[PDB]
Design a protein around this ligand. Structure first.
Ligand code: ARG
Length: 564
């Protein structure tokens, strides 16, 4: 089910038998080149230098404690201590059929966990922007993957629905009785007497006053109604039942600042309440004063990220929390989490992980503006995708838009938006590019969609006998068959990487190499016929699992499929 995992524990045990410590790293990775096998163990030389050994020498001794019959057709040593592993065709055929039996493609369902995923997290009365856009795509993908792996995934849309800014906004709403336009006019008129009533409305909302709280509800509702619509178009799994905004934590904030002083916390600096963290000393060596409650009395983004962590453990019972937030907030998160753990609000088991991403830029590095400038309106981005997508899919037209073409342009358009983001490593600044992403040539949503259709057409347009095809025997004899078969089987371990590291681009690179391997399997390897039905069925069974694997793999990234 997980070849790398299986091999990795066997190599570690051999090593251990050779004198290696218990915590040794076999370093079994997928082979870079087919002449090196399916997998190789890379970590011999490190241990060899500490065992007083030649890399080859250890590796050789290792290869004596290593029981790989039935698993690897052959296992040779190479270069300075590498162990190279060619998987046995039997083993491949057995696990390919076996995987063709589960609707899960044999992918294990590990010890279930409650995972909280903090993603998207826009702000009320401000326009949703590309950072939230990225957060939404990457986070949703992680949600889908973890959901497929079996876990109770709790979506936590951490909306910025609290802050001094509302006093101004709510006042402007009152006088009124374009999200961008609303804030600006309130801003100008607050500055342009507005200001007193608006600070005084910030106090009034802080305290009960249902008149105000309804107004705050009405504002939150306008922003979240619009965003949900964006979420819908993006076929993202976020729903309004998943909104867990900063507001949610207000009631517990004085309970926390209170607890923290009981250890733990200083009224030092200019009044206010600061935790001082020696981990974050100034260059002069002055500890970082992280304010959790101002002299003004109001609380802060830090306070609310503390509560939110404490809450997710104490109340949600998360085993793990994933935060898909822009890289620039990294030390904010590390400061808040530093305080959370010092106060013992969540234990060390239970990760709390910052899955950072980088900025979204335009064609050459400027901060990325939508069509016709403005302040980046995502509905515009999504409109422009579809217009391009529609005109793009116009060629080779015949079937009605209705559900035929229109669903097709939508899959391709929205697919491109997501997949162009997901296919790139999240830590990298992402240079948007219409033409690269809507292409069919490289690692794109449309290329993948195209390939999926090609696989399905190869399969369906032939014959059918589900119950009989399932008794077909899959025999690996060609070298491309063994390669395809092995790639297919690495689907779980790709999933596992994505789920551990939070990097959906690993799957994209998998599904692209996979579709590359099918095309080469299609051309240089004939589909019907040779050994009549014998070999025909095997190849069909491999096109079958490839179809099922692309489908599934793309449904974890949130990317739809057509059949045309
Ligand atoms: N737990 C968190 N701090 N989540 C992220 C909140 C991000 C915030 N909504 C923003 O627009 O920047």
């Amino acid at each position: 089910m997980n070849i790398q995992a299986l091999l990795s524990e066997k190599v570690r045990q051999a090593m251990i038998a050779a004198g290696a410590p218990a915590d040794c790293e076999p370093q079994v990775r997928q082979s870079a080149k087919v002449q090196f096998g399916d997998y190789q163990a890379n970590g011999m030389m490190a241990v060899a230098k500490k065992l007083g050994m030649a890399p080859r020498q250890l590796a050789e001794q290792v290869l004596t404690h290593l029981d790989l019959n039935g698993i690897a057709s052959k296992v040779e040593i190479a270069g300075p201590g590498f162990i190279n592993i060619f998987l046995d065709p039997a083993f491949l055929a057995e696990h390919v059929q076996q995987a063709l039996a589960s609707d899960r493609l044999g992918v294990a369902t590990p010890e279930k966990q409650t995972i909280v995923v903090d993603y998207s997290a826009p702000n009320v009365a401000k326009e949703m922007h590309v950072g939230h856009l990225r957060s939404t795509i990457i986070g949703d993908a992680a949600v889908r993957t973890l959901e497929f792996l079996g876990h109770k995934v709790i979506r936590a849309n951490h909306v910025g629905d609290w802050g001094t800014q509302f006093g101004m906004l709510i006042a402007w709403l009152e006088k009124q009785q374009d999200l961008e336009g609303f804030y600006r006019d309130a801003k100008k008129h607050y500055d342009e007497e507005f200001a007193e009533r608006a600070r005084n409305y910030v106090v009034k909302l802080q305290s009960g006053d249902e008149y105000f709280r309804e107004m705050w509800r009405k504002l939150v509702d306008i922003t979240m109604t619009q965003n949900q619509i964006t979420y819908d178009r993006l076929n993202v799994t976020l729903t309004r039942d998943d909104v867990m905004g900063e507001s949610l934590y207000n009631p517990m904030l004085p309970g926390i600042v209170a607890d923290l002083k009981a250890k733990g916390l200083a009224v030092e600096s200019e009044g206010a309440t600061v935790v001082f963290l020696d981990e974050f000393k100034n260059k002069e060596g002055e500890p970082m004063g992280v304010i959790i409650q101002k002299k003004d009395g109001g609380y802060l983004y830090t306070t609310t990220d503390i509560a939110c962590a404490k809450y997710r453990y104490e109340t949600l019972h998360a085993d793990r929390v994933l935060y898909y937030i822009d890289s620039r907030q990294h030390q904010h998160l590390m400061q808040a989490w530093a305080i959370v753990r010092k106060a013992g609000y969540v234990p060390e088991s239970v990760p709390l992980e910052h899955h950072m991403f980088g900025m979204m830029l335009g064609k050459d590095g400027k901060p990325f503006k939508t069509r016709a400038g403005g302040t980046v309106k995502l509905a515009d981005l999504l409109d422009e995708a579809l217009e391009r997508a529609r005109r793009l899919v116009a060629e080779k037209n015949p079937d009605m838009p209705a559900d035929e073409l229109e669903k097709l342009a939508n899959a391709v358009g929205i697919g491109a938006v997501k997949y162009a983001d997901l296919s790139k490593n999240r830590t990298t600044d992402y240079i948007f590019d219409w033409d690269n992403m809507l292409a069919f040539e490289g690692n794109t949503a449309p290329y993948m969609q195209y390939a999926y259709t090609r696989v399905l057409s190869v399969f369906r347009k032939a014959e059918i006998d589900e119950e009989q095809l399932a008794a077909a025997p899959v025999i690996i004899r060609e070298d491309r068959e063994a390669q395809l078969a092995a790639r297919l089987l690495q689907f779980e371990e790709t999933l596992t990487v994505v789920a551990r590291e939070g990097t959906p681009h690993v799957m994209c690179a998998y599904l692209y190499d996979l579709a590359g391997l099918f095309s080469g399997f299609y051309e240089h390897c004939p589909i019907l016929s040779a050994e009549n039905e014998e070999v025909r069925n095997s190849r069909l069974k491999l096109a079958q699992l490839t179809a099922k694997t692309l489908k599934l793999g793309l449904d974890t990234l949130g990317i739809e499929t057509v059949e045309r």
